[model samples]
Target: NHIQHQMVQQLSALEKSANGRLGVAVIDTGSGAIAGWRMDEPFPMCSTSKVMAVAALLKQSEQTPELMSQPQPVASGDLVNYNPITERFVGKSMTFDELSAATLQYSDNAAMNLILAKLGGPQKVTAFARSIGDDKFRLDRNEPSLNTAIPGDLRDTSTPRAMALSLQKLALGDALGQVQREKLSHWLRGNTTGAASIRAGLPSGWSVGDKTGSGDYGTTNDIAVVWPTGRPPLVIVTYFTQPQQQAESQRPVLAKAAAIVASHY
Candidate 1:
């Protein structure tokens, strides 16, 4: 109990240091223990919502096996901006799994839009979230043209607890079937973004499979399943909204939170 209370205080102090609002949730997958601050409050998910899109597509693929096997052409509209990996494949066809990989591994908005379209829209992604008992997680809009505008009024959001729970389900193979869960895990583990967040604070030999979201208006967030040597994995979710803070500034806050959580285990 003291450890949990200390973790909350550390996170609160980190939030103050960054002059940002923070929501955090850390879970011990082995004992089902959870600790955090502001874990229930909602905040925009930004690119972190892309994981839900991937989940929606993967869930649908089970009923329609063709969804994963079929090759679909990319639309010019999908390549709005900053999609180095997906831009090159514009006009070419790719399988659903390929698009999901691009969306997850590279944070490719273009690939994300394609996958969202295939699954019908943001509502489908929200449905999947609710199916997993995360009512606070909602997807209200697609990623608009890159670096063009921020959805200040948009409410696409999730609570830190919801994210941690969703990730815990994924790690436990309860979010989807075993094969699909493995597929999602593979993509997350291969993620190349957010090098300075949770992973930065981890002890040597620890592994973190995570998704990071950065957006206009100083939003920095990451949701991760962390594996420390000889310990059952932990799911940690951090979301920051600091209109004045640089996105990179939140990295240290997350790193500190990771270190605090690690000390407890």
Candidate 2:
């Protein structure tokens, strides 16, 4: 397809701009098919794991909104450091709904940690991944699921492929019910990461529901669903990691890569 060909060239341009490798995975739900390109290959998911966390929360919430509404106390001192909802940490506490909001809207590590704990911890999350047929996805119980300290030029302990599959399930509402899906989409719309990458490359006025992840080391990832009115929606997952933690250097690459893909479709 012309779009596919153009995408390859644009990805090259994006790689050049970001000064790092880029990966793109797209799924056309209408056809039930998938395509992907990895310049430097897959790595850890970083904040992208929150996407999975949100999905799991949505599923559980749908089954038991009452349970989801139960108030959970914050640790105060420790939570205020890594969480966006610091107001709750003043011993104010928050419900499961608020926790999900913080987890997705701000990639709040504390929110994720709580949700991860609620969903039977990281181990259950990993089990959920496999049950959903996402064999490529794994969450290390002993360490932060997305960020691992594997030394050397080791392949990123994660890959975009798992996310791509996860998105497919999410889009199909397999991960949650209608009401929960709406909540998940609403929260995803508020994501604050990777603004320069996929968002910059996409057309104005197009609704982009996505989650972007970034952290120490050159790591940035955006997995989003672009709903261009009157056209089939597109699921794009792009990620890159570098030895030097230069997110700014990697942003342009993702943006350009996104532009290339958007132009094709």
Candidate 3:
């Protein structure tokens, strides 16, 4: 793995710039073997776990396209539905498309729960994660369903390597149908907001299919497919956290890390 050595140098540069431990999992889409560093280590998955959630939703939908077009009743009374007119929370009914957009694009907590609930529950989502060989991932739901935790069983839960592997399988269409894969990729392509990590590394208009998750306590995570077209794609999973109320602050670092990998590898 010559690329592993190069990736190590890039990671070292990041460590020099920021004094915190970073977990990363990078794979060469062309080679089908591990090609980077710090992959086995675990990190809090943050919102990146939503990628699994979205995949699970799509998988279920493939079983029944009716799920996507079906109207799901909003269950949580405490959750907020955006009112485009007043730009505030108001009671409203959203179709599956709206819920998926809110969950993927905005990482909307309320919309995520609605999807989770409709998909059977966190246990089902956790099972889906395991079905993809992601042993370290789980979901723990709290009150009102706004803050379902991923560290339900594993200590503080997840690592970059495992997250990356999970994402790779999804991107490669390993565990889903062609239709499911197409739907998932289409939804991910629609993701415009959380492009910091994988998206930052690639050239503009280079396709980045990914999902970003941010928590209230400065936990940020992103997983995606970085495709430069002629070159093989790369599957990347990165997680960053700061305790000083600096969640947004970590986006640049995450972006830089992904950019470094894309540039050198």
Candidate 4:
């Protein structure tokens, strides 16, 4: 049993390169084993929370199929600085499905807020996480602000252990029904922003459906359910954060970490 020497050393090297801390975790859905560094500590979630934001919605939609087709309005005030989808459809409305697609695939801020509004806010998502057996994840606020990345602040933050467990249950376990799970997987696979992160680092023929988040303090996160040919799927999470709020984005760090983690598995 090799104990992940390279996954550790390489991540340490990458951590020093960024002058930051990295929280990494690889959960084997087949074995329930965890290999990682600092995965139990808290880190800012940024847009990665969109995974659960939509999860809560999907669960609710299952109980009320009408929920998915319900129209959620996008007013001008709903617009945020980085809302790519909501801005284009501003003053128009999108169904729960369309809004969630924007939120998951594009990380659109307004689509997220609309989902928050429709679900009664971030706590509802937090409740869903707890329902699925996550004890270390919390959603305290909405986007833009939730990306604060203030070191040691647990608000709007989740540990790698908690996140990987949460997604493992959702994506690979029985937390979500088969149909809703497929829907979630479909949206995750359609993600458009991961070219430079986890997706880029994956080996040929290996596929991953993931969600990413970028925020202040040089924080960039990717949470994934990675599938390798002839092997069971794995849940991988890499969260990196620098000391300064103005720290430059370290998305490249994620790719390197991802390549290393893939090999370790």
In terms of lDDT, the best-performing candidate is 4
User: After superposition, which runs of candidate 2 have C-alpha atoms over 4 Å from their true positions?
Assistant: 1-3, 77-81, 141-145, 148-157, 245-249
Deviating ranges (above 4 Å) for candidate 3: 1-3, 75-90, 142-156, 243-248
Pick by TM-score: which candidate is best? Answer: 4
Kindly provide the TM-score of model 3 when superposed on the true structure, using C-alpha atoms.
Answer: 0.84
Query: 2 or 3, which is superior by lDDT?
Result: 2
* Ranking of models by TM-score: 4, 1, 2, 3
Q: Each candidate's lDDT (Cα)?
A: 0.78, 0.69, 0.67, 0.87
lDDT of candidate 1 over 1-265, digit per residue (tens): 2236667777788888888788788888888888888888877788889887898787777777777879889867778556767888777888888888888888888888888888888888999889988888878777763321143444687888888898888655577877788888878888998688877877868777889887765777888888878978888888877754334436777777777777877
Candidate 1 pairs with clashing backbones? none
Ranking by lDDT: 4, 1, 2, 3
| TM-score of each model, paired residue for residue | 0.92, 0.87, 0.84, 0.96
Residues 42-63 of candidate 2 have per-residue lDDT tens digits of: 5667677777776877777776
Listed per candidate, the RMSD to the true structure in angstroms reads 2.5, 3.0, 3.5, 1.5
For residues 77-146, write the lDDT of model 3, one tens digit per residue: 6364431221233355677767776677666667776777777877788899888888887665521332
Please say which candidate is ahead in TM-score: 2 or 4.
4
Q: Would you give me the overall lDDT of model 1?
A: 0.78
lDDT of 4 by residue, 1-265 (tens): 1237867788888899879999888888778788888888999999999999898988888888888988877889998858888887777788999998999999999889889988899998888888998988899999679888898888999998889988888877788888889899989888999989988888868878999998989898999988888888988899999999898888888898888888877
- Name model 4 segments beyond 4 Å from true: 1-3
